[PDB]
Design a protein around this ligand. Sequence first.
Ligand code: NAP
Ligand code: NAP
Ligand code: FE
Ligand code: FE
Lengths: 337, 337
Amino acid sequence: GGFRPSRVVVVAKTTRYEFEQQRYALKGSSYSGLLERHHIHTKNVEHIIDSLRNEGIEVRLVKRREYDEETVRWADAVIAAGGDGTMLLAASKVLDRLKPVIGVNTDPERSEGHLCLPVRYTHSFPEALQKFYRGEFRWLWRQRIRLYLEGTGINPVPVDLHEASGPQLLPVRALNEVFIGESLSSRASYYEISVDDGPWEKQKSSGLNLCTGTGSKAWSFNINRVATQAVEDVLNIAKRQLPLNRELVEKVTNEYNESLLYSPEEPKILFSIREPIANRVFSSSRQRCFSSKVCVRSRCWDACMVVDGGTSFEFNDGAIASMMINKEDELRTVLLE
Amino acid sequence: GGFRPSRVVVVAKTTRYEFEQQRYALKGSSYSGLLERHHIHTKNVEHIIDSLRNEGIEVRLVKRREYDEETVRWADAVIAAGGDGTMLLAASKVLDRLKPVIGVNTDPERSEGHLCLPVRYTHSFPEALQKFYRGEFRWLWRQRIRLYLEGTGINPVPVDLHEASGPQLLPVRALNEVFIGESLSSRASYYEISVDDGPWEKQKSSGLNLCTGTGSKAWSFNINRVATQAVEDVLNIAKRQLPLNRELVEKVTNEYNESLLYSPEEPKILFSIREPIANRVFSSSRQRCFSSKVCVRSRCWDACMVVDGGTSFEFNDGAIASMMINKEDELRTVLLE
Ligand SMILES: NC(=O)c1ccc[n+]([C@@H]2O[C@H](COP(=O)([O-])OP(=O)(O)OC[C@H]3O[C@@H](n4cnc5c(N)ncnc54)[C@H](OP(=O)(O)O)[C@@H]3O)[C@@H](O)[C@H]2O)c1
Ligand SMILES: NC(=O)c1ccc[n+]([C@@H]2O[C@H](COP(=O)([O-])OP(=O)(O)OC[C@H]3O[C@@H](n4cnc5c(N)ncnc54)[C@H](OP(=O)(O)O)[C@@H]3O)[C@@H](O)[C@H]2O)c1
Ligand SMILES: [Fe+3]
Ligand SMILES: [Fe+3]
């Protein structure tokens, strides 16, 4: 049950310093902080490449603009070298459930890397390669959401945010989430939603978030999690309208918040109405729920459907989107100690 | 203590139908629904104008593009004829704490009108005029936020969303709120905030909301309010880790949520971090709090400071904004039964 690829594409993030270069000594604030960050990431990319080549593996190192589907098909395995952002980028071009995608955190002090290998492998990559070769790991297939688009006036062409018609399959899958909303941050969004083929219900809010189990810890977590002060208050209306302290409040906050996370393997969508407006003229139903399918009718003026923060689609009045989870969209990942 | 103005400007909202006209029978969905809405609003505007003129009051009726500061100064009183959106529009051009601004809800079935006179006066406007003339009302001065801008690379020119340097006063006041965030809905916002001259703390989130007491019921309410299911859950961790029902859950939800609203007369800012990202690489302090002053240092790429959903200012890395509450920005409104 081992695993040793012969061909690997590494797709490495572009650093802020590289960004500033491709755009023009100490300008404003974090001047040489950018250069320190750049050297850490570069050191780590070289460690990964050297380790692979030392195992006899043929490696091709690309940035964003040269990470393409052709390079993915050439490779036996994709390695994202950066942070969770780099894993989303890499996963966006993999649509084959058998193709391994592995993430290495190249700046652990500034990159969370929740989708990447544990931090120790960043500077101990031959060790990870040995664990793979020896089968000392397990496969984790992360469920992903796929998007269909139909209706009138639709435009299914994807837009890369990093620079009547029947249902058509959009060319990207969501590993984290589909966000839906007006482009203007302060403009309320208006749509109708049907969950698991239920009746259509109108909604006014600041958007909709539809996440996977993998995405349950990302945007969705910060949309729905309850502040420890909010439960201090809520538990105080309780005794007014058991004793409390920092102990009990922290216990109840974390149980509630853990209830927002679910397994990346579970094929269900966590769907949240983001900041709904109720009041005396509009009304809203549930705020969050699980489902296997949610369809959205756009009633918006200048709105987008945004996949993993990276790929955007037009979604204006007349457009109808269907999200669901399909086994062939499972993203093949690894789990190490 | 009566009140009868001689000159009045009425600023009336533009209807969707007027919008469609100024842009070109039954196109898509709500076809003649737009025309029904248009006739209701027009009927009501005529009732207001006829009532005023029947009291001997000279009236000038304007839409958005002709509501200007000159017309405001000509008038003894401004009347916004539409919904809360129209009140925000009208208030945006009044900077004199002595100048009355009155809102009439011209479509009560579709307009909340929380800033407007009670719905009965929409078709009983001579009655409101008599109550004013007789002193059968009270004045309500609603506190507003003012914005200063300083730093490097700043651009203080306002942008109408409806189509090194020392601190300079921005030309609009917030009756509802100042929103601050990246323009791209899915891009995390990065800034430093100082509350009541406290130490600077970095923050990563989906933006900041800074509202008045008037704005406490608007965006801020939907940013912070707790769902009745979330307290059902929270009260269930409580008994596990008094009896519950629909009764007790609704009682505790509404006490908690009422704690988010405060008097429009109170001169303090309710400040919320909108969807903060904590995790193992960033950290956040309080989520919401009251204050008299909050200063924000922009660390953003393409961000805006948006006042009452209507006026937008550039706010990118190097810009520094100061918000506070000043008595001369009080907005003079009326309260009737
Ligand atoms: N207010 C919010 O919570 C908010 C706003 C916008 C986007 N997001 C999330 O950020 C995603 C895009 O990430 P990005 O790296 O391109 O931009 P980003 O601004 O760097 O993402 C914000 C942080 O979330 C972390 N993250 C990403 N995916 C995660 C996951 N599945 N579980 C736990 N944490 C995760 C990122 O990890 P790294 O540090 O390793 O990059 C980063 O620390 C989006 O799909 C969305 O979920 C959240
Ligand atoms: N997710 C959200 O909650 C969200 C998102 C964007 C904006 N907003 C709020 O909407 C304001 C702009 O309003 P808009 O009419 O131009 O666009 P809008 O989309 O029509 O406003 C949304 C609703 O809030 C109501 N509202 C406005 N001010 C209020 C207040 N002080 N207290 C209670 N309710 C209020 C509006 O009343 P009417 O029906 O009479 O118009 C409307 O029903 C912004 O300042 C912001 O506060 C809220
Ligand atoms: Fe990132
Ligand atoms: Fe409105």
